[PDB]
């Protein structure tokens, strides 16, 4: 509102409009530009906003002003456009600022949704897709909101990726599709023990490490890794660490006996154990782990 000798904001409507797939592909990734117009569905209505209330033009994306400890960002307009003064009138002014932001995205088990660093929730699996059974991953959105492009070459504002592009009511989020099983794991490697002594007593195995002062207690029967849900890291991490530790301390004096064996210790610890031998002698579930190793250290000391 333009009063006499002063102007006052009667209101400021603020909204986040997603950039459609078509613009992301043909404008932003192709030329590093956005449209000055925002056409999008809000409150069950197709709404169109023109930057400065002017005709639609292509606007260059330029780096955002640097802020410490923030990711890369780009935008098209730096100033808010307000209507020119006409006395004793309510006037309206539109600003459209196309913003592209690299962000970190985080997902917790069972990975049916993820978050962005901006605090926004995406109610889709990060591993949702069309290939290798990824279409059975969780999606909350309609089919038209999700796009997957094979052979996608990103252009910085060499190697192609499979690009997931999901249009939410507020934004479009794009990332690289990867198969779920090689990516996530319900267990993580904690300790590498180059000298772990196994003793059989009382129907139990005791795995003692002098280096970390720890005695784990397992049953005699092995733990089959098929009982672990999404536990594909365990075998691969176990084999590389075991062979690396072997090819560094026993490659000359010891031989491996058999293949690595798996055991579940009290406290919820998964032990991958390669037995050695001296030359002179020669429904899937999630394992719960306690936060305190002190019981096993007391066991070792005692």
């Amino acid at each position: 509102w333009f009063g006499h000798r002063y102007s006052q904001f009667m209101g400021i409507f603020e909204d986040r409009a997603p950039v459609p797939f078509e613009e992301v592909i043909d404008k932003i990734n192709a030329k590093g530009v956005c449209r000055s117009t925002a056409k999008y569905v809000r409150n069950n209505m197709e709404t169109t906003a023109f930057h400065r209330d002017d005709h639609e033009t292509d606007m260059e994306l330029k780096p955002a002003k640097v802020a410490t400890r923030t990711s890369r960002g780009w935008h098209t307009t730096d100033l808010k456009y307000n209507p020119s003064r006409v006395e004793a009138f309510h006037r309206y002014g539109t600003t459209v600022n196309c913003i592209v932001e690299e962000v970190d995205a985080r997902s917790v088990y069972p990975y049916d949704e993820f978050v962005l660093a901006t605090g926004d929730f995406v109610y889709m699996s990060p591993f949702y897709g069309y290939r290798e059974g990824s279409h059975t991953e969780h999606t909350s959105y309609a089919a038209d909101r999700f796009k997957q492009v094979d052979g996608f070459y990103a252009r910085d504002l060499t190697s192609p990726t499979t690009r997931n592009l999901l249009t939410t009511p507020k934004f479009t989020v794009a990332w690289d599709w990867v198969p779920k099983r090689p990516a996530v794991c319900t267990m993580t490697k904690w300790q590498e023990v180059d000298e772990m002594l196994r003793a059989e007593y009382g129907g139990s195995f005791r795995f003692s490490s002098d280096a970390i002062s720890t005695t784990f207690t397992t049953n005699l029967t092995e733990y089959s890794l098929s009982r672990v849900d999404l536990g594909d890291c365990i075998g691969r991490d176990a084999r590389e660490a075991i062979d690396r530790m072997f090819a560094r301390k026993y490659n000359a004096t010891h031989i491996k006996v058999g293949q690595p064996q798996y055991y579940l210790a009290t406290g919820g610890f998964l032990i991958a154990y390669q037995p050695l031998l001296s030359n002179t002698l020669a429904s899937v579930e999630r394992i719960k782990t306690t936060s305190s190793i002190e019981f096993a250290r007391l066991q070792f000391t005692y």
């Epitope: 592909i25 038209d144 796009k147 492009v149 094979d150």
Partner: nanobody, 125 residues
Framework: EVQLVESGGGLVQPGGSLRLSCAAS????????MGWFRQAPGKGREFVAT??????????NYADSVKGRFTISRDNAGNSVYLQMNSLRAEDTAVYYC????????????????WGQGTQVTVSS
């Protein structure tokens, strides 16, 4: 996983018409690219046409040779692609392959896409 079923090829005389059909079943929901390639005797499998629902209205691309003679369209519900070839000539004699994939270009293609068995098209007198 997508199954592709082709139909409608065969033998025809120069200047005739032929409509190839390709029905797609399986995980076909969402935007995708469905098209036709062809392989001539001793020649590589080259791009013929594509129809892409990644954009609305859908985008159709054609090879230079077939432009103006070949028309690519889709079913009302999608999931089926039709190639109307009119004014056929000797260069059109080839095995035409139906493609369903999730790509954006015309000619690149990849191993993750789905090919049909291949339908023979012969143009001779």
């Amino acid at each position: 996983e997508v199954q592709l079923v082709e139909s409608g090829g065969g033998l025809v005389q120069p200047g005739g018409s032929l409509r190839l059909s390709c029905a797609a079943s399986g995980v076909t929901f969402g935007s995708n690219r469905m098209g036709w390639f062809r392989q001539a005797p001793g020649k590589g499998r080259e791009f013929v046409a594509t129809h892409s629902t990644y954009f609305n209205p859908a985008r159709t691309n054609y090879a230079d040779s077939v432009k103006g003679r070949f028309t690519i369209s889709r079913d009302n519900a999608g999931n089926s692609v039709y190639l109307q070839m009119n004014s056929l000539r000797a260069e059109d004699t080839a095995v035409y392959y139906c493609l369903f994939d999730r790509r954006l270009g015309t000619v690149v293609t990849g191993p993750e896409g789905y090919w049909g068995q291949g339908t023979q098209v012969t143009v001779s007198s």
